[PDB]
Design a protein around this ligand. Structure first.
Ligand SMILES: NC(=O)N1CCN(C(=O)c2ccco2)CC1
Length: 435
């Protein structure tokens, strides 16, 4: 695998030991061969699991998620997917790693797709080797891969709202269930219904994942209600997955606004990773997978791939060259390569709107490309009436940094800034000048 111009897809089935058995062997060989190596974890939670798998090996953990004291001599670095892409975008020296290892390489967040584009381009240029570790590479059509123990697969109507009757099989179960929902708001309603029926429910989403995931170890629970973030190496001691088989798809309409379309079917890769949370113990056959819909290739035209192009257009590669998306996922976007390349000052603004601003890539790009500076929030109030953001069925209002109460009506509307109460609170803080 470790030879230059090699990109290897390590596609062993979910639970086959890619992270705990194969990765340490790769890392040992990389150190022996004096390959400057990067390991990319999708989340802080996986970064901490990897330290356990790699324990004693000389690895520099470039994350506060890991409590270890470095020798200072490590030639292997570990960081999050998003951290790698962020550092590429910033005026920060990123080593031209000889070996690029991405764990949970199916992750479809913009920064992960962009990292795969950058890495696979460096491999294509003859500069580097890469290993992408995932059971579900891009365009996989197999929702039911092999498992450590047999799984009982059942197609069944799954509730997406509170229910009074008709789904006794949900609550009759005496084990532990991981339930994939399409959104935080949908999970909140199902969680309230289960809690009312006497169940102990933990909710997971991107923003809450590190705090709330610990509760799956520290408290007794009956259900985990999770968004798709639990597709990325989240492990549970569960015997059932309930899978809506639904997700939200961010869609750019008329190059002008982003909507959260759907819910709609998950990809085969997503379905396989959701199912793959169970069947992991060869001594516990008959874990159950209940699935409430079919799969479709809903990544086609999904905003994350356009946003990945916006990131890659702003990453230095060599002179004016621009990294391409990883070939198997390159047709998910129609973009002119280089169309989103910004001049130095607008790029710095773009980066700050994503990092400190916590804005979606697409929205950060609209603001930065308009020549607006990071702290100038006038655009949060001067949109068309149809861009009015709502709170409790009335237009949302903030006090501006000038002390004026104004309706929140952004010039560019991205549904992700108000998709749940937490998102709206954050965007209200942004519009008021509070970060
Ligand atoms: N660019 C980032 O957001 N990184 C996370 C913090 N980084 C470390 O190396 C680190 C902090 C504590 C122990 O390691 C640098 C990478």
């Amino acid at each position: 695998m470790l030879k230059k111009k090699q990109l290897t897809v390590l596609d062993l089935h979910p639970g086959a030991g890619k992270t705990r058995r194969v990765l340490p062997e790769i890392v040992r060989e990389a150190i022996k061969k004096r390959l400057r190596t990067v390991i990319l974890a999708p989340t802080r939670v996986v970064a901490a699991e990897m330290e356990e798998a790699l324990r004693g090996l000389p690895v520099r953990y470039m994350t506060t998620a890991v409590n270890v004291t470095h020798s200072g001599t490590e030639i292997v670095d570990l960081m999050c997917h998003a951290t790698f892409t962020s550092r590429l975008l910033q005026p920060i020296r990123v080593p031209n790693y000889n070996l690029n290892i991405m764990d949970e390489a199916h992750f479809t967040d913009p920064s992960s797709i962009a990292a795969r584009g950058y890495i696979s381009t460096r491999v294509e240029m003859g500069e580097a080797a890469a290993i992408f570790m995932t059971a579900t590479p891009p365009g996989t059509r197999d929702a039911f891969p092999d498992s450590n123990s047999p799984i009982m697969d059942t197609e069944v109507e799954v509730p997406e709202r509170a229910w009074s009757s008709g789904f006794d099989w949900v609550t009759d179960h005496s084990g532990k269930t991981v339930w994939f929902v399409p959104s935080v708001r949908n999970g909140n309603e199902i969680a309230a219904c289960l809690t009312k029926a006497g169940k102990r429910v933990i909710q997971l989403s991107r923003k809450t994942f590190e705090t709330e995931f610990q509760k799956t170890k520290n408290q007794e629970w009956d259900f985990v209600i999770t968004t798709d973030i639990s597709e990325m190496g989240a492990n549970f001691k569960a015997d059932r997955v309930i899978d809506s088989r639904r997700c939200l798809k961010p869609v750019i309409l008329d190059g002008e606004r982003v909507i959260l379309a759907g819910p709609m079917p998950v990809t085969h890769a997503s379905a396989a990773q959701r199912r793959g949370r169970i069947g992991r113990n060869p001594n516990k056959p008959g874990d159950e997978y209940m699935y409430g819909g079919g799969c479709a290739e809903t990544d086609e035209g999904h905003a994350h791939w356009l946003e990945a192009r916006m990131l890659l257009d702003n990453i230095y590669l060599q002179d004016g060259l621009i990294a391409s998306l990883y070939r198997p996922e390159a047709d998910k976007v129609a973009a002119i390569e280089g169309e989103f390349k910004l001049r130095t000052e607008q790029r710095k603004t773009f980066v700050e709107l994503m990092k400190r601003g916590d804005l979606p890539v697409w929205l950060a790009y609209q603001v930065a490309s308009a020549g607006i500076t990071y702290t100038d929030r006038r655009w949060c109030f001067d949109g068309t009436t149809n861009n009015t953001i709502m709170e409790d069925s009335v237009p949302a209002e903030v006090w501006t940094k000038y002390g004026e109460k104004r309706v929140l009506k952004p010039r560019w509307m991205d549904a992700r800034v108000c998709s749940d109460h937490a998102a709206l609170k954050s965007f209200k803080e942004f519009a008021a000048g509070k970060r």
